[PDB]
């Protein structure tokens, strides 16, 4: 008949409790010891400059009102009781369309220790916003943040801190990486303060460091473009007396470049900067267009010195650009 003890204690615990007020109002700051266990680092939405992340968002805070002495040190509570006791309104500063999973029942527990050290764990799928500066594309690496802090409480009423050492408070599961074009290199955290008009607030930043995986692009777009410029340079190899052959080869080169450029744009969102595709595709476009112009010059000239010199010059220029570009963006941080 031990069920009666738990029923009595749990029922009588919440009497005289005012959910609206924070713990220890008017006598001390409420320290919320947070911690995150990333169940899975969802896909990085390159187009929308955001990423999805599934997290077990744990967070504990001392509360003297919910103090009980009983046979069991820890009293697991159902989701119904979780709403009837105060909880930190820890919103995400860069969150966008976040969802709390509810299948089967709400994914959130709330354990009250004897002293009153609540542990409010929940499962989320926050789609935080990651401002991406895709200027060093595709080598671009981004330190996507996950700023989160209280909404209604200033720095003087609710202060967030990591329950463990900051380095050991954002744990990512080994198999949780769902990235298709990135690599979660590591994590870094900090606890700053935000100066808002209505007051000061405390923010618990966590910078997830991501490096784009060049494997997909280097084969989808770069290699076909390099092939095409080689084909354009092959057009010089053909004898000048065969006008139609060089004409059709030259026009085919630019048709191919058009196709590749069209494919490239759909992969990434709008970017008004000299991104990788912009720079490299433009340079290759100019190379093939110069091949067409060179053949036009050859056609008017009528193998002669001019043709051979013009042919040999270009591949050195293309190799120079490739070396400069690759060595640049590889070393750029």
């Amino acid at each position, epitope marked *: 008949d031990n069920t009666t003890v738990f029923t009595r204690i749990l029922d009588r615990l919440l009497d005289g409790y005012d959910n609206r007020l924070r713990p220890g109002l008017g006598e001390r700051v409420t320290e919320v010891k947070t911690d995150i266990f990333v169940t899975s680092f969802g896909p990085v939405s390159d187009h929308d400059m955001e990423y999805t992340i599934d997290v077990f968002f744990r967070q504990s805070w*001392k509360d003297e009102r919910l103090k009980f002495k009983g046979p069991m040190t820890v009293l697991r509570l159902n989701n119904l009781m979780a709403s009837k006791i105060w909880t930190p309104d820890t919103f995400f500063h860069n969150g966008k369309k976040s969802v709390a999973h509810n299948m089967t029942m709400p994914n959130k527990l709330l354990r009250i220790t004897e*002293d009153g050290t609540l542990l409010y764990t929940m499962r989320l799928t926050v789609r935080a916003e990651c401002p991406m500066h895709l200027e060093d594309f595709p080598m671009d690496a981004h330190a996507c943040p996950l700023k989160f802090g209280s909404y209604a409480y200033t720095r003087a009423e609710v202060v967030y*801190e990591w329950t463990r*050492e*900051p*380095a*050991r408070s954002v744990v990512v599961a080994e198999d949780g990486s769902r990235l298709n074009q990135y690599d979660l290199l590591g994590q870094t*955290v*900090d*606890s700053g303060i935000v100066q808002s008009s209505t007051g000061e607030y405390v923010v618990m930043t966590t910078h997830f460091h991501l490096k784009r995986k060049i494997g997909y692009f280097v084969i989808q777009t770069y290699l076909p473009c390099i092939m095409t410029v080689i084909l354009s340079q092959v057009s010089f190899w053909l004898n000048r007396e065969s006008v139609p052959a060089r004409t059709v080869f030259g026009v085919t080169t630019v048709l191919t470049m058009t196709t590749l450029s069209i494919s490239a744009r759909n992969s990434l969102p709008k970017v008004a900067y000299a991104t990788a595709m912009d720079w490299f595709i433009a340079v290759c476009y100019a190379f093939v267009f110069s091949a067409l112009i060179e053949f036009a010059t050859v056609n008017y000239f009528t193998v002669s010195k001019i043709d051979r010199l013009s042919r040999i010059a270009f591949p050195l220029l293309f190799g120079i650009f490739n070396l400069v570009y690759w060595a640049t963006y590889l070393n750029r941080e």
Partner: antibody, heavy 117, light 105 residues
Framework: EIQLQQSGPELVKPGTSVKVSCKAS????????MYWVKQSHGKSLEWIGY????????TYNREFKGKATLTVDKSSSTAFMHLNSLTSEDSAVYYC???????????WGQGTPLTVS | YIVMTQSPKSMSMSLGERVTLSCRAS??????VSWYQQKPEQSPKLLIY???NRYTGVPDRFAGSGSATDFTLTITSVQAEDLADYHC????????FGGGTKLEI
């Protein structure tokens, strides 16, 4: 105010274990982790390990892994450090800190002189 | 672990002058870099926590700074009570303090 009283100076031959305490009275003992640090003469502070008094969860530095045993007495509101297999290097002064939050060690003990010979 | 490097080994300066004590962390430590002052035969006393926040009861002349790895503690006007060893102790990872720079006349 907060007072961190430690055991007085002691002298012992090598190899014999010792016990040094750390009494905190100002604040509720179980709230904050109690850190233990070592500082040899003229040298820097060296972290030994910290004990979470509430659940007695303990962590030690790798060098001191098995060198010092941290135990706590919530009833007495005191933190004890038990050293064993004492050697020449162990001669130093040990303080017990008090980690208020992730930033700073709020309060420090008086420092216990330990000499081995 | 993270190794702290008190670049100035022992600075000596007369009273009423500016002195800055650097503190380098081997790895990223965020803003969790405290500063402590240890008078001879006395326990350390905190001066600056966070990166620049000043602990209560500290004279205003003490002032810190530092973003990720480079942290500096500046004394606007050294006085007769500022002569002691100063250690910077991070807490981002497990604690690891610095060598301790000595201050003299």
């Amino acid at each position: 105010e907060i007072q961190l009283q430690q055991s007085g100076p002691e002298l012992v031959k090598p190899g014999t274990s010792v016990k040094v305490s750390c009494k905190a009275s100002g604040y509720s003992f179980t709230d904050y982790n109690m850190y233990w640090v070592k500082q040899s003469h003229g040298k820097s502070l060296e972290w030994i390990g910290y004990i979470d008094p509430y659940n007695a969860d303990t962590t030690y530095n790798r060098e001191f892994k098995g060198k010092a045993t941290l135990t706590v007495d919530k009833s007495s509101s005191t933190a004890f450090m038990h050293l064993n297999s004492l050697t020449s290097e162990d001669s130093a002064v040990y303080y017990c800190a008090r980690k208020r939050n992730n930033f700073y060690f709020d309060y420090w003990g008086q420092g216990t002189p330990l000499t081995v010979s | 672990y993270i190794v702290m490097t008190q670049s100035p080994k022992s600075m000596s300066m007369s009273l009423g002058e500016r002195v800055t004590l650097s503190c380098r962390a081997s790895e990223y430590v965020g803003s969790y870099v405290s500063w402590y002052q240890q008078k001879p035969e006395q326990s350390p006393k905190l001066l600056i926590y966070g990166a620049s926040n000043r602990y209560t009861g500290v004279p205003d002349r003490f002032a810190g700074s530092g973003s990720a790895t480079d942290f500096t503690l500046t004394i606007t006007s050294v006085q007769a009570e500022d002569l002691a060893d100063y250690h910077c102790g991070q807490t981002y990872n497990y604690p690891t303090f610095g060598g301790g720079t000595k201050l003299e006349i």
